[PDB]
Swiss-Prot record, chain B:
Contains three functional domains; the central domain possesses the transcriptional activity. Transmembrane segments: none annotated. This is Virion DNA-directed RNA polymerase. DNA-dependent RNA polymerase, which is injected into the host upon infection and transcribes the phage early genes from promoters that have a 5-bp stem-3 nt loop hairpin structure. It comes from the Viruses. It comes from Enterobacteria phage N4. Belongs to the phage and mitochondrial RNA polymerase family.
């Protein structure tokens, strides 16, 4: 009688075992104990809410608050009057589409005779209708409340959707990640798919309805009825031209692919729309506890209880404390930076920091696609920032004294991420306008310690390697720039502060002065320095300039410290010193190491090893003439378009440290060899497309120019030199696309493909794809990637790559078993429902039944616990388990598949989870909750912005947090979960498909052709004892390193190292001598543990 | 010789307290006739087996640094010698005798 008294006019009885028509709306939802929405019980929600928005006094009375938001002024009130009238016309469209549905094929006539038309996949909206004469009609309270949710969704959906990477797009389309076309990713994130639009809209509809789900009701109605309403509202928005629908066909690019995907984009409002200063008036008027809002002053966001998009995992108490500290920081608006942005204008901002205007008649088709994506990011960030400024400006007359708070949540890899799309932590444009840092300095004397901090901040913003030089040397470098190239730019900024105007050629002045140092952070350095020059009182200068403590190769260094076992080697000691770990050198900073000891970082070290491997490969095939020519063509092509590859006049090959940046970072991230090859080739094709645009530009200026000079005009001193380069380009492309190398029996053989490149090119629409693209990747994989991966292994160590292999095998095997049991357990439950008369196919299972299936998997240890963090590698949301349609609209379109939260195969995702989660993720968690933690800082991943008044103390604390995170044992945590899984697993109950996947990870190629169940089980237990041996070695190494004196300078910006107060002196020793001393303590620790286990003359 | 090698091997394991072994087995088990007529240098060059041998000698000479002690490398060099003697002195004569349908 609870919900049966609020909606007594609904069609059908509320009994699950009735005879006629049953109402599944009242059987699936229940009234809450305390109210959550103010529209429950009303008769005209679209009229009561519109009345409350007509005045400030009425808004306060309806909301029951002392005062409303100051931004809710008269201009905003007028704009909401038109929006409410627009929402009344949306309801008229919905009411007219229902009458057509009941008229075609006599649906209404049959439904009134007893036919269960409300249980259809498209008739699920018939559970919220009422009888009216001989026909049916909507329920006014339910219909008008859903319209209000659509209006709020239309205003803020874009600024809340997630960002799709290349991996996500590949899964949706089905095309291989390494063969994704040009601009496909940039097209996908512009709009949203059907599933994303409907699911997000349906979430708001349920919230506004203010009801609670029934745990014993089928998932086909608790999730289908809200979804069926969302699809109808989205269809109405398309008819009203509020949402534009675009259809992309995969058969155009891949004829073998028959998938069709629709994309929906919301039409955006004007940048001067007054509604942009307060777009959450409807949300705060309906919900008792609004979710979308901006926090001012003492308004502190609440702490989330579960991980991001991982509802099965809850934040640990240690993780919740870190979130609370990060949400207490106050942000402030820098007025001089804001006025500079609006004076320059959006057009000049795009011209300076973007691609500017585009003339598509002189651009390549593929080149123009990338330029538009660059412009979109800058333009969207500019619009988002100035909408916030409008809201802040209404709170007080002084915009610089309004504190701002931001919400945080935990990423599945243990990373604190700001909520929203464009915020200081994500957008660089917004980062320079809203700052949490402040300082007061005495700059009246140039020899003060305060002036040295001021110079350090300016130098780092102007692209100067401050962590590789001493303070005195850095000061000399900055002085030359200030009085040299940057002088014209400073003069313009000085006039701007006093007057407030800019010249018509301001873009050209900044472009010439900055050059290769152009960035958003470099603009603030010019303004801050110019403001200091005109300050009347330099002894109390207040500035928001900061210094960023950036880690030196944070990724690779963490891996070699956390997942390395065995005895110490001199090579490890030398290579780990480049990361900031010094043994036997008290109070040694990174600036001293680079200046005197070693000036090569990890990126340069791997480049040198790559040259060594490349020379050995060529010498192996010295007698093979066809193989030698193929290697020459690959290097020749990369020399023409990549600045990191250079060939001398004598044929000597020279490489730069910039060729191993990306490969080294993604190698630690578990990416395979094919992934590196695909990215390397993509860099070459981008340069080729850009060179085609120069051909079109040169032809327009001079139609009589030659083809060679139109291409390599600026890369050749003479015309004859230009003709030489053109011949090289044509020959290399034909050679690299005609034959490919095939690795058989351990040797490489050239095999023809028959799909070589022929004909005359067209600069406007030149494209490389199909079999031509695959031929290029085959040559790159076997001739350049293989030598590259050998050099990387030599630097990081052979033991580190051994730990990654066992970790990948252990996680993949566990995920395969979990996925098979989940699918095998929901099919047995469905077979039981087939004997239930009150059950129909399409209702799926129940939330109570789904929770029992997941609880039965607890004896296999699906989650990894480290004591302060939790990880769930196999968790995902997929529609494979349900394999059925959830709901459609009244036109039998917009079919939405049903997706549930079920485990899935891991693959190579195990390595990134533990390298990042226990690496920089744990370091930043400690830094926010440690004793005497730094205050007023912005914590970007592997970085931290610090004010000029606390650079020394905060940098020392950052190095202390790094040392704490190096005492962990990620392998031991994985071993403990894997040992429990092996105790309870039963391989004899696995499907034949599952047994084939496990054999691909535990056995060799020859051993898995006819392997039995016993062979697979025996091979899986071997991995268990491999993890135990690795984990024991890591534990001993950390114990030994804690007994000696160490200096930690991983955050090398300032030069404030941290000492571990060890009591063993290893100074005045070579790395060869230190390894022997460390190995002596390693053998003593092993003896004690084994001895403990055993326990006159 | 075989008895002497076994005694020395067992006396080294008392004091200290895989892939190329398969390629050499394929060399001595060839049954083509047109391949064995080209000599044994060609088969080893085509068989890629020269690469695992280079890694071990590089540690003995000292070109490539390694953490293994003397007793670990001695057990590796003496394991390759016994593999060639087992394959070429015992398994090869059985292949030749298996081409006749009779016991000579």
């Amino acid at each position: 009688e609870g919900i049966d008294a609020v909606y007594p006019s609904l069609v059908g009885t509320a009994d699950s075992k009735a005879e006629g028509i049953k109402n599944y709306f009242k059987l699936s939802f229940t009234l809450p104990e305390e109210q959550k929405s103010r529209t429950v019980g009303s008769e005209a929600p679209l009229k009561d809410v519109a009345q409350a928005l007509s005045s400030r006094a009425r808004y306060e009375l309806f909301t029951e608050k002392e005062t409303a938001n100051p931004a809710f002024n008269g201009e905003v009130i007028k704009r909401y009057k038109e929006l409410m009238e627009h929402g009344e016309g949306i309801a008229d469209i919905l009411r007219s589409r229902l009458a057509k549905f009941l008229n075609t094929k006599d649906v209404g006539k049959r439904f009134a005779q007893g036919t269960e038309a409300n249980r259809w996949v498209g008739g699920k909206l018939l559970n919220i209708v009422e009888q009216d004469g001989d026909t049916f009609k909507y329920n006014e309270q339910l219909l008008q409340t859903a319209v209000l949710a659509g209006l709020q969704w239309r205003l803020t959906a874009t600024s809340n959707t997630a960002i799709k990477d290349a991996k996500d797009v590949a899964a949706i389309t089905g095309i291989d990640q390494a063969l994704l076309p040009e601009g496909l990713v940039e097209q996908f994130d512009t709009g949203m798919t059907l599933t994303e639009a409907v699911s997000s809209l349906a979430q708001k509809i349920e919230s506004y309805w203010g009801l609670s789900r029934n745990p014993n009701a089928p998932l086909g109605y608790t999730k289908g009825i809200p979804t069926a309403m969302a699809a109808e509202i989205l269809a109405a928005f398309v008819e009203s031209t509020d949402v534009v629908e675009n259809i992309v066909d995969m058969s155009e690019i891949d004829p073998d692919n028959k998938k069709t995907i629709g994309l929906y984009t919301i039409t955006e409002l004007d940048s001067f729309d007054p509604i942009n200063s307060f777009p959450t008036a409807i949300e705060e008027a309906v919900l008792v506890n609004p979710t979308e809002k901006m926090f001012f002053g003492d308004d502190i966001p609440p702490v989330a209880n579960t991980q991001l998009r991982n509802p099965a995992v809850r934040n640990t108490p240690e993780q919740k404390a870190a979130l609370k500290a990060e949400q207490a920081t106050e942000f402030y608006v820098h007025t001089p930076m804001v006025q500079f942005y609006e004076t320059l204008g959006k057009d000049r901002i795009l011209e300076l920091m973007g691609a500017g205007t585009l003339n598509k008649e002189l651009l390549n088709d593929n080149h123009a696609k990338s330029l538009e994506g660059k412009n979109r990011s800058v333009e969207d960030s500019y619009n988002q920032l100035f909408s916030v400024i409008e809201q802040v400006r209404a709170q007080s007359e002084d915009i610089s004294t309004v504190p701002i708070h931001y919400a945080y949540n935990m990423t599945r890899v243990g990373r604190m991420q700001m909520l929203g799309k464009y915020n200081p932590q994500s957008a660089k444009l917004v980062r320079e306008a809203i700052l949490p840092t402040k300082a007061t300095l005495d700059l009246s004397n140039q020899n003060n310690e305060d002036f040295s901090a001021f110079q350090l901040g300016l130098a780092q913003a102007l692209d100067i390697k401050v962590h590789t030089m001493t303070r005195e040397v850095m000061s000399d470098e900055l002085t030359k720039l200030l009085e040299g190239n940057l002088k014209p730019a400073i003069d313009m900024m000085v006039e701007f502060n006093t007057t407030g105007s800019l010249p018509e050629n301001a873009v050209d002045v900044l472009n010439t002065a900055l050059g290769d140092r152009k960035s958003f952070v470099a603009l603030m350095a010019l303004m801050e320095y110019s403001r200091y020059l005109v300050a009347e009182d330099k002894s109390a200068f207040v500035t928001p300039l900061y210094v960023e403590a950036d880690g030196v190769t944070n990724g690779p260094i963490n891996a070699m410290m956390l997942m390395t076992g065995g005895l110490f080697t001199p090579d490890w000691i030398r290579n780990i010193a480049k990361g900031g770990l010094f043994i036997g050198s008290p109070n040694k900073t990174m600036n001293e190491h680079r200046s005197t000891a070693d000036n090569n970082d990890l990126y340069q070290a791997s480049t040198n090893a790559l040259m060594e491997s490349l020379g050995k490969l060529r010498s192996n095939y010295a007698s093979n003439m066809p193989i030698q020519s193929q290697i020459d063509s690959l290097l020749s092509l990369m020399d023409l378009f990549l600045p990191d590859i250079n060939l001398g006049e004598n044929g000597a090959l020279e490489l730069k440290r910039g060729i191993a940046k990306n490969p080294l970072t993604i190698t630690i991230y578990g990416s395979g060899a094919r992934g590196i090859a695909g990215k390397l080739v993509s860099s070459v094709t981008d340069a080729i497309y850009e060179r085609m645009s120069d051909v079109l530009k040169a032809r327009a200026k001079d139609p009589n120019i030659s083809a060679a000079m139109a291409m390599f005009g600026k890369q050749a001193a003479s015309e004859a030199h230009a003709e030489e380069l053109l011949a090289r380009f044509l020959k290399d492309m034909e050679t690299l696309t005609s034959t490919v190398p095939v690795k058989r029996k351990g040797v490489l053989e050239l095999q023809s493909t028959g799909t070589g490149a022929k004909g005359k090119i067209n600069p406007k629409t030149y494209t490389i794809k199909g079999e031509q693209l695959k031929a290029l990747q085959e040559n790159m994989l076997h001739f350049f990637v293989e030598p590259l991966r050998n050099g990387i292994t030599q630097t990081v160590g052979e033991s580190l790559v051994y730990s990654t292999e066992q970790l990948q095998k252990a996680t993949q095997i566990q995920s395969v078993v979990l996925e098979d049991m989940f699918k095998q357990r929901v099919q047995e439950k469905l077979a039981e429902k087939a004997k239930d008369p009150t059950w129909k196919k399409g209702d799926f299972l129940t939330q109570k039944e789904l929770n029992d299936i997941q609880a039965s998997l607890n004896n296999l240890a699906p989650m990894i616990e480290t004591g302060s963090q939790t990880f769930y590698i196999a968790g995902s949301e997929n529609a494979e388990v349900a394999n059925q349609v959830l709901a459609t609209n009244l036109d039998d379109r917009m079919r939405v598949p049903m997706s549930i939260y079920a485990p899935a195969q891991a693959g190579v995702a195990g390595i990134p989870f533990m390298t990042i989660g226990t690496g920089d993720g744990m370091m930043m968690q400690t830094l926010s909750t440690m004793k005497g933690a730094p205050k007023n800082t912005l914590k970007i991943f592997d970085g931290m912005n610090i004010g000029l008044n606390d650079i020394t103390d905060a940098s020392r604390k950052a190095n202390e947090a790094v040392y704490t995170s190096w005492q962990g044992n990620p392998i031991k945590n994985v071993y403990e979960s894997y040992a429990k899984f092996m105790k309870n697993v039963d391989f004899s109950k696995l499907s034949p498909e599952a047994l084939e996947a496990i054999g691909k990870s535990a056995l060799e190629y020859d051993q898995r052709e006819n392997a039995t169940v016993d062979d697979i089980a025996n091979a899986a237990s071997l991995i268990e004892r491999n993890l135990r041996n690795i984990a024991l070695g890591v534990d001993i190494r950390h114990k030994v390193l804690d007994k000696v004196n160490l200096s930690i300078d991983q955050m090398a910006a300032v030069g404030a190292p941290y000492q571990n107060n060890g009591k063993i002196d290893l100074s005045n020793m070579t790395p060869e001598q230190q390894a022997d001393e460390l190995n002596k303590l390693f053998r003593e620790e092993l003896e004690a543990r084994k001895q403990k286990v055993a326990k006159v003359g | 010789i075989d008895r002497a090698n076994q005694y020395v091997t067992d006396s080294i394991e008392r004091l200290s307290e895989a892939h190329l072994a398969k390629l050499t087995a394929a060399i001595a088990s060839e049954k083509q006739g047109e391949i064995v007529a080209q000599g044994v240098m060609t088969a080893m060059n085509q068989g890629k087996v020269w690469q695992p041998f280079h890694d071990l000698v590089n540690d003995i000479v000292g070109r490539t640094k390694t953490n293994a002690n003397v007793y670990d490398l001695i057990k590796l060099v003496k394991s390759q010698i016994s593999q060639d003697r087992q394959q070429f002195r015992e398994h090869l004569p059985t292949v030749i005798a298996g081409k006749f349908s009779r016991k000579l």
